[PDB]
Symmetry: D3
Subunit: 191 residues, 6 copies
């Protein structure tokens, strides 16, 4: 429709006007850390229990210990999002890849067709697995897991790839189903 999209989603799900002090505080921290308050967080912020559960999982997967780099996990995110054609996540995580790699072209490549990127084999098979999980998880076999081991991932690493991949298969669906809008600031960042 030729009307400016509602933010943070197309759902009437108020936050609402005086935020609870703890959520207000949290958002001050994001603003400081991030330069913004990501709209996915405003989306969950109508209920702090929900926001807490969302963020606890996001942080663990994206920022917690793993032998997958932060960038690597962001790369997975974008490839999943590209396959699901998730606008929110392509914008948000696209930015993250441009930031963490210092390579705007890599972000564009992953957003558009990851197969064109001149990646080392380790990163490429990581993304191929995520892709196959995204399109046809029921068809993943032991040989697919061995491909990952053949390029240096151990079983904990495979678990991490699977969870990051599965997580964006969740968040893409939620974002797209609710018409979740990415913060306008992302688009011009790290270009």
């Amino acid at each position: 429709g030729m009307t400016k999209p509602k933010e943070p989603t197309a759902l009437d799900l108020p936050m609402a006007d005086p935020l609870p002090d703890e959520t207000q505080k949290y958002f001050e921290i994001c603003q400081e850390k991030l330069g913004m308050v990501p709209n996915v967080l405003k989306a969950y912020a109508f209920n702090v229990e929900k926001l807490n559960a969302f963020t606890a999982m996001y942080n663990d997967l994206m920022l917690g210990e793993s032998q997958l780099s932060k960038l690597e996990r962001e790369m997975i995110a974008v490839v999943v999002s590209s396959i699901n054609k998730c606008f929110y996540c392509l914008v948000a995580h696209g930015a993250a890849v441009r930031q963490l790699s210092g390579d705007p072209q890599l972000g564009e490549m992953l957003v558009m067709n990851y197969r064109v990127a001149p990646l080392d084999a380790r990163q490429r098979v990581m993304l191929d697995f995520a892709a196959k999980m995204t399109r046809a998880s029921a068809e993943i076999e032991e040989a697919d897991r061995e491909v990952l081991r053949s390029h240096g991932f151990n079983d904990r690493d495979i678990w991490d790839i699977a969870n990051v991949t599965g997580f964006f298969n969740m968040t893409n669906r939620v974002a797209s189903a609710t018409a979740m809008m990415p913060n306008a600031e992302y688009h011009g960042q790290f270009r």
Copy 2:
């Protein structure tokens, strides 16, 4: 192959045996309330923080406050899992639908082809929306959401449908990509 499937997954992700006190307890409680310790929990239990993040989200979405019944969320779970052909989730959540509805055939119908179920339109459109997210969330439009509203769901309700559906799009992928095995007790229950 022609070998007993490893449990809880085909990954070597030891727990290990002297469990942390808090995880031991969670499990004891599961056993006592559920008659078993669901295998998904043993898979995350190598890391209490990951287990914590998983369970908090699971419990909020499936058991936390909602205008969707517990049964309705499990129905969603089964329909998503059927489309993704997730053995773990079809077994565990199929069992849940059989349990909560006291109707073995309902479980079977949602496992196999939800369209045959003689549901009221409220529940049918809920499932149609989950199916559409699962297959093609990028194609969800305002009109799709208005369909839910036209059968009595409000926007908080739509949010809940969207999150339960995205969650099983994650957990199916994790389960399938890691060859996660459902507890054998499930198969013969609530028949």
Copy 3:
């Protein structure tokens, strides 16, 4: 619709009230052999010529001579039905696999995602071929047939796999298109 489904199909195709003596007799025999009269037979029973042709083919393929076991042919049936999401056939032939193997878990695995089953290679490639025939028969090549020979099937066996597979691609379509309902007794059998 929230109305108990019509049996044996949603079509008004009466049998009708006094069955012809030969069909009545036949049904007495089924009841004895099977404990029930399968609803697919009631579906064809409005015309004995049609019932005769249906049953002649079913029997030859499923029960006639072959070096494929009875169970093996039932396994094919369920994998085809799973891919086509045929409720009738998944219920009827699912039961048959649970019965003939004495392994309820095997039936569930084939109904839900056959790839998880710890089968020997012979049975697994048999099912992979059926699957490929079901999704993309035009793409079957000589190398696909040689895979079967590489695991001990001769050309007569391949012919049998193809016909059993093709047959359920027929019966699934008829059942699903007519809203053919499986006999309630199947669901609880052989659990």
Copy 4:
């Protein structure tokens, strides 16, 4: 490869030469009435019981009583075969449509893209329903059947459409999986 395709299929399924008397006769009759012995029959003819079961079903569905014309059933056959890209069936049944309609272009249209054919709505919806069964029979709903009724088909008619369509979903798969070759005479007939 660059070798003459084996007939009647790429399987070594000898007939063999001194045919059983009854099969000899059937074939003589075919030759006399059809100008040829269709290759599908030679493929089943290694086993008279299999041949018997095939022909009984073929003949009932395609030539037996129906309110669908013979041509209409062959049209169905061609549309199913086009979607499945079955060379044998497209050649043989394409020829049948050209023959029965006395309209070479009609055959070509149904082989290539049935949607371009300027059909009356009765025949178009019949074909749309066959196409939908062929692609996604699990998605057939009561509304789909009501469409057929709204163009003058009764429930016996729907049954017939469903069975002819399921039958070609079987025979396409058998033909394609075994590299069944249509008789070369077909190609130049009714042009």
Copy 5:
């Protein structure tokens, strides 16, 4: 609709009545060379600049220098058209393959399912590449190009295969979207 299709397309795009002398002249030449004026040309003939650009590209690709034979390029055309189910092009280029090969059966095979044709490997991998470009160009990799080189195509040849393939992915779409009708004369030619 049961009304004779409009030619050359279903669009009201007049040529119009007195053709410009140069277009009239050109059409006299086609009629002489071809026995007809192909309807695709009448379609573009409302604007000679458009006709000029269309024909310049067609001629270069189909008739200009290449180490791909004329027939080979026509074979590509038909395989692309078959996958896109383009009636116009299947008829027009089907004829061309029957003509240039002097083998009606080869035309039918490519129209219906090219995989059945007993081609040498060079021609078969040429068509497999075109097919993969047609279904999933984003997935073409260096190894796919090396397959072509492994059967004697150099890089100029690969460029030609790609352009011929891409061109019919254009013309199929235009023809099908506008309901472009093939000249009736094609159907009976070269049988």
Copy 6:
């Protein structure tokens, strides 16, 4: 692999260095008007006749007379390229949309998921029609065309939409099949 991608494509198709005078000039003009020589042109430039045929068609469709704006045709280009996941075209034509609209986010939306764009219905239905051609042109019906007319497009306009859309279905395939690289300057422009 982990090697700089070859430009302008991964094919060895030398231009070569002393360019023909007329191609030199074209390129000088591009540089002067565009700030660059688009890589697609260097790929065709090994053969002036091929380059001539490409550019004539490009220029007529994208820059020649139409009731579609230049921007509208580039929007079409981007939507087609997104569906085909064409990196070259998404970069180059994405940049064009950002340039002509003076709206960076519009480019991003059409690259990622055009459905989220708040377009007027005229432009949305234009894009829906392009998308449908791209995915399934054989399924375009008179009703699809009438939708365009109902938002003010005439039949010449529909023709133009159809040709621009088919053209990017060609150029995406060529680009992707040959690993054509977009000029690096594009990525950071009009942000």
